[PDB]
Amino acid sequence: MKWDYDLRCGEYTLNLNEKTLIMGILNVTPDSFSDGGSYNEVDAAVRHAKEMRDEGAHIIDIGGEFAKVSVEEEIKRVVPMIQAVSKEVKLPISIDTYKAEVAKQAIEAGAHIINDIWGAKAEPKIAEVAAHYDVPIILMHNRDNMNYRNLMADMIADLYDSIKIAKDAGVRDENIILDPGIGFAKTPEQNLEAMRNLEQLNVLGYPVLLGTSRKSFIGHVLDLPVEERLEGTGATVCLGIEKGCEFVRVHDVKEMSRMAKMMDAMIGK
Amino acid sequence: MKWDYDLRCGEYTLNLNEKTLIMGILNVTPDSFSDGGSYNEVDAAVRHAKEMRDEGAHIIDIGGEFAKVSVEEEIKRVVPMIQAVSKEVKLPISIDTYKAEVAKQAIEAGAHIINDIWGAKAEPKIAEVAAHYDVPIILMHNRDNMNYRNLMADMIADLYDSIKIAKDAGVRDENIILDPGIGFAKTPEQNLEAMRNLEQLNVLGYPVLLGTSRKSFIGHVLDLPVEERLEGTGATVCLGIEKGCEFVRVHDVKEMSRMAKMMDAMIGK
């Protein structure tokens, strides 16, 4: 249908036409008296990954950045979690990092997808890591300023700069996913505007991931704290899917999997 | 903006451009040892109308049809509820009836809007009641068979037949609201198809109400019982709003008011 290839994630394969793919956000709370890999913190992560699998998640997102942490210490946290989760939960894993070295150890430890909040712009070598291991990479829209001439024209220009960095490093078109970076470098009004105009990202010819779960633009509209943002997140997931997004990144996996599934049936996905 | 008039409901006025209007469904459980108007059953209804008002409802929908009931007995139930609710809760009231005589007493007892599941086709005199009291009337799509040549072409043809009955009786264009009658005379697949194509109803030039709350097409997609249909209802409300509907008729007023509000901000309503 829309996509003439599947997303290839080593042992796992994700069909981009059958359904909206749910990326569950692993809650990753560090042990205070620990250097990483301790029992309480890895056990908590594994229990949460199993719950999210049981609730309809298709991908488990894991990041290493409570306590301030260096690149070495970021690796010592994330690597044992990736090892335990990939052994114990049979889903592809994405590593949430903008650092080449973290991306590399995370993949060597078992991660399948790179999730980069700086779209290969903070550390362009991450795209070389992606190109060598032949993994999918999510290039998120971000910048270090909010000075838009024209929000969507500018986001598309910036995403294309990320695509260029990734292609010049030898990333294959099939391993590129884009993300409008909701809640990054954008005022609450720009986030609403990006949501209203999300379908424009489809001209670039790549699958789009949307991440809106619990973000402050929803609290800004509803005047509700982070724990009362489920309905608002749901509205953003539904619009995202109606505008053609292939993945949503969410905390409330059970509720959002049911909304995604209803949306899919109505739109004929 | 889209609408150059407000919906005029006697003492209350509903702006059709500011926001999606939430019609809350009054739960109307009859007393078993009672003829209507008893304390337990009217008190339950009033408490539920106050809760729904506090939760973001803009209209309270009240119907009279547990125990089997005649036209006279339908009036004895609905009339005391309308009287108490209209005295105690300051929102417009719609009367859910396809019967001319029930519509008439309900308005005389205080109801502001007629909600007709047969679109003036079961009892065409209801449109004369509507025309005399100068109240808004919701004409829902319904039929006594599922023999569609072409679902949407046919729904639009049938709605237009309702509009004709209503205009010939002297109903003013400003007092007409349409509704695609989701869950009426339609298979679960036709309900999905009507949802996918809802924007077509906008060619008729009238405000549209959508009622999907907890309906079996959602249980059919999600394989979930009536008490576990909140997320699925939410997806239908969101798509409905994205496709231009002015009202949604819902049981879960708190959750759906928050979803409607998020949707409004994203689409620029």
Ligand SMILES: CN1CC=Nc2c1nc(N)[nH]c2=O
């Ligand atoms: C890694 N994070 C953190 C917060 N939000 C996001 C994220 N990654 C992606 N791809 N999209 C997001 O919205």
Ligand SMILES: CN1CC=Nc2c1nc(N)[nH]c2=O
């Ligand atoms: C009165 N009822 C009962 C069940 N569903 C509906 C209804 N009225 C309208 N307008 N729309 C509905 O979907």
